[PDB]
Design a protein around this ligand. Structure first.
Ligand SMILES: *[C@@H]1C=CN([C@@H]2O[C@H](COP(=O)(O)OP(=O)(O)OC[C@H]3O[C@@H](n4cnc5c(N)ncnc54)[C@H](OP(=O)(O)O)[C@@H]3O)[C@@H](O)[C@H]2O)C=C1C(N)=O
Ligand SMILES: *[C@@H]1C=CN([C@@H]2O[C@H](COP(=O)(O)OP(=O)(O)OC[C@H]3O[C@@H](n4cnc5c(N)ncnc54)[C@H](OP(=O)(O)O)[C@@H]3O)[C@@H](O)[C@H]2O)C=C1C(N)=O
Ligand SMILES: [Cl-]
Ligand SMILES: [Cl-]
Ligand SMILES: [Cl-]
Ligand SMILES: [Cl-]
Lengths: 476, 477, 481, 476
């Protein structure tokens, strides 16, 4: 890592200060220092984004594509640097960190392809005699300056899912990364600064939530796009004013294991362990609830206990580590408190369960009451809950027994069960024969209920960052 | 003649709960009918019924929803004169234009009947990288949930239709609050819907005054608020909406450019300008408020427009000869008259019309209105238009955009390049070429940017906001 | 409501108007053999005149706005509903089609025109971003669909209303003038449609409907003024017509020997499966281009399915198609029944066994079920087009898929299964136009893409897809500097 | 150039013989020798294509994309080699040759992007009570083995418009390039041979038209896609048998100059000279007929005579050459015979007109009667005809006064004239404010009337190389 990082104000690196300390989430020592933006800098960034609307809009589509393709090439060259920085600032196991840099590249690559493909349309207006001679044409224009707020757990790829569409769509933006994990955003900033984007087209400004009011309230932003916790996101919607609001939040995702799965339980168990425990459960679609049919429950339980106990916890820089530290000791203590309450109420820890500082073991529980915080709130840690069902409709009801609705998974070979799950699960996406934790970066992605408002995935984010501009032409 | 009293509709059924809401004839000023006024207990009951109707409504196949919409079309056609006359009374809308809106009401439900059997689904290729080998993606649209609908006084039928008909096509239960000044049209829509086999709770139509309507914005069981009305109200309701999606269809001060090449078609242009500026006495969210005309045609356009404006017949909207009926109230005529007087005091000149008697506001044309005047920058929503002159097309575009609003604009031109530039640079929802900004057909994407709205109506586009994508990812190994 | 009688003579339609040119074409009641009516037979001079009028109608027809074409289509819908019984009874007589299934086809006629009425106001155009490289900076693309030109339509005897409708109704939606030649054995329905179409304000020359025997129909294939030949009929004829079509686009809707797979997991729903198999195999005496000809049933359910299917097949009433109790009416002619009976006799001679039905009397062919038909037999590999189905047994699902594909044809196949992976494998591996899951391949709804691959067709019908073939893209590139 | 080139049989270089001599079209000397495929080799290629169907269909989309991206990267590496080979075997001026190599890269680039977004669909089938419970899904599958025939004038890019879609769609193909210009196609074959396409996925086989019968008649091909002269194309359609036929032919394209174009006449004349005389008019959308309004006719005529005379004719290896040799002396004699006939009937040569062997000057004529061969047949040489109009409907009627209908151009600033041109010109494509000679490689491209049947451009070609495969699912 560099000794200091700047922030990016109107496309240019500014070593304004070194007030924001970023710690190695495993050793707790300060790893680097970056410049912290104050309100005057955020205001300057917004002013410059307003000024860049017209130059940015004049860029032809192939120039936007070229800019995105430059990012792709440089992320490829700097692949291991990006992964190592992610490993340090997020505590993310090095193999998962490489997974994320691969996705970062995927996301920018899809955006490069979509930048020359933005949907326009023709509409037939001659639907009645009054409208004889009229024809309709629409194209998508930038919504205007965008305010982007990203979280700690995928500090490259979840920032990418706003930055890359904005570049494809021609919106200037100001991005506030997570203060705990700002480095990846600032490496994206350095790469973007090398392109011929108009000055003001982007700023990337670290700022604590307590100094971030302008990202929500400033009327010069036309879009607020927030990825993070449900409690924060719904509060920001209340204060956004006139701008459009897109929310990517979290949930307590469930995976159903159907009665017909005996012969493939080793496959199911492997995916369940990945979904529940990769990057230590700190995924908005991490597996938290496992709803297993009575016919397979016993063999699944035995296999899942074994697999869970086998996952190495420790130094995320070690390729053998599967379970790194949680983002902070305080977050481990929150989850450990929910776990202890669940246990005192009758639940049993059947694998794992030890917590030391931010080091939370991969843990499996049985008998968690559905009214427990551990069941109903977002665990965001390496805990999974196993329950048993015999009626498939009851399994669906259990998945839906939640404030949230991001993604769900169903392991089944029953056509009608897959159909019924698609129809009845009140989630953004249903995954068949994999865990809810699966995402590919072109697919529409987001939540309903308390889990979000809108869809990301390149094409869908561009939709929200643009406005239809209709032309009606009358011929006489 | 109207019925002596109208019910409201609670969970698909007529309830003559009371007769508290008096509806006046906007021309005679006398009470024309009385209708049932919903209290908060009735609105709460309607919301609970809508929640309960979600699953039965979702269970209806598309062809059943189409049959429900087609029944509405047939009954609206059947009751065409009844609807137009009620509209004429409760809105003071000239009878020919009332008949025009009933025709649009039919069109809107007809488009929705067609769209109900072709709601968009999709396939997604997910095999974009080795990690995703063997995955395929399918998505369909599901109802967003119970919808809260608020409609205004000026197009009570068609602007309610642009929410109700999409909701029927999409399978969303809804609760509609019509404007208290003009609730009869919506209650006739309710009577027609009550004839269909929609599940109970699929719809409620509840008159309520704004000060009793808090739940339409704040109740957490609604998943969408779709509001059509004044910008001042709409942006305030967005602040209080909570978690729900918000769609806003508001107003503006729409402009029309007349280009330098228009000499040979000026009679056509003037006719459309007068229609746009003075149709239903300017009470249109895309009424022509500002006319920006090139110096080359300005003198001939001015003479023709003054003559046309002075020819428009004002009076009893029940008279088919009437083009300018009453404004919705004397207080609204007084509002606009005050801006007009302030503009004249600052140097503007009335060149046609200008006389106001109660709610009877003449079709009025001004020159010399300063760009900083309330008459220029605020939504007139009355039979007043402002004429100004330009010579540089970019100046004309800048003048169109010199506004808080951005709903629609119009450009009369035969220059390909000027049309291209207008489409590119006018910050509006829609640009109309060779007709006024006041044109709308009910299938087109329709809405505003800047302070004029958030989102699009028109059947397909409304369905899109009333539904959520539900993705299915399937892994084969 | 009432028993109708056919008119004594029917005209043909030349440039939208009835011409009682002659009464040379006798149309028989296919059950009684008796001549039912006579219609005007068009000669080559009349065909040429219709083609010339179609050319002349292109510009007027192009000038109709979309809502006018919708109103024309809606008029047909309204009148087909008014004349529902007239159409069903005429269909019953001229095609020998059981009256309940004739009513079913008139319902499809209505649905097909209704879908076309809806599609007529939403014909797709598009925008194209052309700024993909520095050279193309400032260019933008717009495209709309325009009529392909005059269309030649040829339709068969078995679904004479609805298969004509799948060409006529898209042509009206797309704005193509057309000349329709119906099957000489079943021209009445097409001419009733012509009468209804004559009532509309279509420009003169927008349509002609001309009965003509195949030996006098050469211009329908070869005339250079037609820009599209769309043929629905036998594979042998269709592929030959393509060879003689010349420059025009060619669309073919042909036949096949459709198969239905019954998977191992279907025991609890066998009564439903048997009902659909019997419907698919024997509806209109198997004279359907997607009739079930081959049933491929898993060993786990085979014995139970076989007993239920034999009983269901035996229960089917054969007789006068005017009798509403009749499900199996006459085949279209005695010679066609003799063709199929000979293939059946050859299959039995090589070891097959008739396990239900099998009696043939003139054109009255019993609903018949066979076991043990060899895969090399004509009865297996050629289009039966009669009330015969063949039952075979499998255990390996890949072997079942290979058996479905073991064919010159590829129109539709059906699979009864609750296995997600089997449905996916079937979708992926069956070389057919359409795979039906948990119903027979005989299912069709008139908006869906429909057609064959291999020897079963070229192109797709279903309203939206037919419109696409009857139109050309017209691109506009606009350069701004 | 290499001394000898192989052909490609089932993805492999085969030095079967050196029988096909390829000449330098300017010097006339033999430049190289290539292997000539006989009927046995064509048969083996077709058999190998049938065998490759299932392995090729098994490739996931991202693998097809990587194969196409490999081609793009290698064409960039071999850019000068491709351009010089084109300049020799086609006699194409070197700057025009580098232009075509750039297009070759564009075409493959677009195909790589489209390979991962081939359209499928959902259809709502519940349109009547009979169809309650049914749902529709469709995807596109390869049509099968494709027969490709390409012409001499754009040897690289017009072959690319068949090859690249086939790779994106998963169809095996056998390509027969033009015998006069096969080197480009064989360099493409060498690059394709480097990839992990299954053996049999592609063959590229030089063969003279007289030995090419199997490319039209073999029933194992499911598609014939031909680009070349109208006379050959319509003949091949008649012999194609059951296979689908796609035809990209030619025409006598027209450009209208409207009455309002005085202020931009230098631009108009520049584009006219480009469209009429680039690669010596040997383009299927070369400008052959110029229809100019009386109001600007005299000023355009003067500027166009001066422009045409300024164009340097000579050695195509010299970058200063704009007008290289025509493909053969006999093709020059053909065009010069039509020119002499039109002059004998009263036309006047007003610029150029000199022909020496295959060196045909950029030439402009007036007064060519509309019944002349020079007017109605495809000139395919550096000759353009100027005529005059006053009524816009007359100008439209003149454009349509042809057997052909590929593209037309209209220089106008009249909105209504542009709308009318779009509506009434019976062509595949109308170009507004550029010549009909414009093409970008993603746009739908093709002719109506005698000019073609079907559309190329990557997305549109893929549509013709695939079949819809519908799945109807009944739930009860
Ligand atoms: C996919 C992956 C994860 N998630 C959801 O993310 C959170 C876990 O992330 P976390 O960073 O801990 O969430 P957060 O809400 O606390 O902070 C996110 C960003 O918002 C900033 N922020 C907080 N509060 C404010 C206020 N008042 N104003 C402005 N900005 C604010 C944070 O600032 P810092 O102080 O941390 O710098 C930070 O930038 C889980 O809930 C998980 O579900 C969602 C995913 C998805 N759906 O795509
Ligand atoms: C864009 C550019 C050009 N064109 C159209 O192309 C021709 C000029 O090209 P040309 O090679 O001279 O045309 P062609 O028809 O003579 O030959 C083209 C290819 O077809 C092969 N070929 C001819 N005849 C047969 C037969 N009977 N069987 C098989 N193959 C045959 C030729 O073989 P060679 O003997 O030359 O090796 C050659 O491969 C102009 O009309 C021009 O308009 C079209 C374009 C477009 N629309 O995309
Ligand atoms: Cl109308
Ligand atoms: Cl990967
Ligand atoms: Cl370029
Ligand atoms: Cl039905």
């Amino acid at each position: 890592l560099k000794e200091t990082y700047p922030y990016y104000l109107a496309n240019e690196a500014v070593y304004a200060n070194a007030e924001l300390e970023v710690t190695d989430k495993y050793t707790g020592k300060v790893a680097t220092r970056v410049a912290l933006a104050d309100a005057s800098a955020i205001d300057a960034a917004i002013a410059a984004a307003v000024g860049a609307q017209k130059p940015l809009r004049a860029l032809p589509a192939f120039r936007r594509q070229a800019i995105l393709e430059h990012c792709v090439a440089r992320f490829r060259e700097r692949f291991d640097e990006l992964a190592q920085a992610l490993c340090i600032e997020a505590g993310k196991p090095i193999n998962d960190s490489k997974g994320e840099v691969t996705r970062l590249i995927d996301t920018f690559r899809v955006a490069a392809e979509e930048s020359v493909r933005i949907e326009g349309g023709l509409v037939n207006l001659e639907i009645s005699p009054r409208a004889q001679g009229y024809s309709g044409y629409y194209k998508r224009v930038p919504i205007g300056p965008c305010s982007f707020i990203s979280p700690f757990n995928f500090p490259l790829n979840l920032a990418a899912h706003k930055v890359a569409p904005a570049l494809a769509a021609g919106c200037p933006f100001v991005l506030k990364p997570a203060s705990r994990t700002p480095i990846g955003a600032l490496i994206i900033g350095e790469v973007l600064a090398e392109t011929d984007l108009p000055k003001g087209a982007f700023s990337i400004l670290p700022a604590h939530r307590d100094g971030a009011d302008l990202f929500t309230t400033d009327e010069r932003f036309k879009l607020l796009s927030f990825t993070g916790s449900p409690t924060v996101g719904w509060e920001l919607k209340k204060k956004a004013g006139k701008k459009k609001v897109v929310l990517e939040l979290g949930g307590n995702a469930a995976a159903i294991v159907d009665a017909d799965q005996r012969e493939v339980l080793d496959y199911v168990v492997e995916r369940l362990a990945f979904g529940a425990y990769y990057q230590s459960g700190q995924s908005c679609i991490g597996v938290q609830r496992i709803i297993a049919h009575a016919d397979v429950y016993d063999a699944l339980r035995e296999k899942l206990i074994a697999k869970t106990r086998s996952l190495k916890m420790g130094d995320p820089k070690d390729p053998a580590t599967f379970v790194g530290p949680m983002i902070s000791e305080s977050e481990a203590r929150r989850l450990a408190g929910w776990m202890e309450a669940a246990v005192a109420a009758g639940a049993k820890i059947v694998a794992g369960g030890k917590v030391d500082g931010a080091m939370f073991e991969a843990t499996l529980l049985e008998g968690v009451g559905r009214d427990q915080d551990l069941y109903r709130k977002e665990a965001f840690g390496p805990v999974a809950l196993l329950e048993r069902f015999s009626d498939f409709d009851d399994a669906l009801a259990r998945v839906n027994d939640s404030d949230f609705g991001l993604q769900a998974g169903v392991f089944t070979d029953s056509l009608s069960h897959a159909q019924r799950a698609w129809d009845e699960l009140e989630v953004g996406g249903v995954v068949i024969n994999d865990v809810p934790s699966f995402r590919v970066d072109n697919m529409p992605y987001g939540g309903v209920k308390d889990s979000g408002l809108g869809r990301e995935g390149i094409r869908y984010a561009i939709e929200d960052m643009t406005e239809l501009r209709l032309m009606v032409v009358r011929r006489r």
